[PDB]
Write a protein that binds this ligand. Structure first.
Ligand SMILES: *[C@@H]1O[C@H](CO)[C@@H](O)[C@H](O)[C@H]1NC(C)=O
Ligand SMILES: *[C@@H]1O[C@H](CO)[C@@H](O)[C@H](O)[C@H]1NC(C)=O
Lengths: 49, 52
């Protein structure tokens, strides 16, 4: 007439602050560009959306 | 102490008074139904980022 009781549960590890993966959702994207233009014998650079 | 009219069998003995604390491994039996806490200690050697 002897008995034994057992229990357990699940938790989260501490290393989740360095090793993890992330799941994202995407939408419409923007664009940008950079150019070189030769103007009266000189090189100039421009940057714009 | 001496007990009269008894065999070596049919008797049980144990040591029951302690003055230190010990970690509660799953390989040792519990003291009572609800355990009493006495302290805590920390785990060394954390993680970090590096190059290889
Ligand atoms: C560097 O480690 C920190 C936590 O210590 C973490 O937040 C970060 O994402 C890590 N960066 C890289 C590049 O591993
Ligand atoms: C700058 O202009 C000169 C002409 O003046 C041209 O020869 C040269 O290729 C230009 N620079 C670059 C990086 O193309």
């Amino acid at each position: 007439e002897n008995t034994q009781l057992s229990e357990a549960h699940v938790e989260k590890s501490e290393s989740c602050k360095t090793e993890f993966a992330s799941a994202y959702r995407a939408h419409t994207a923007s664009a940008s560009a950079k150019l070189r233009v030769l103007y009266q014998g000189n090189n100039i650079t421009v940057a714009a959306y | 102490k001496v007990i009269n009219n008894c065999k070596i069998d049919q008797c049980h003995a144990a040591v029951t008074n302690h003055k230190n604390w010990q970690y509660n491994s799953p390989l040792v039996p519990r003291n009572a139904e609800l355990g009493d806490r006495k302290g805590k200690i920390h785990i060394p050697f954390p993680l970090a980022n590096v190059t290889c």
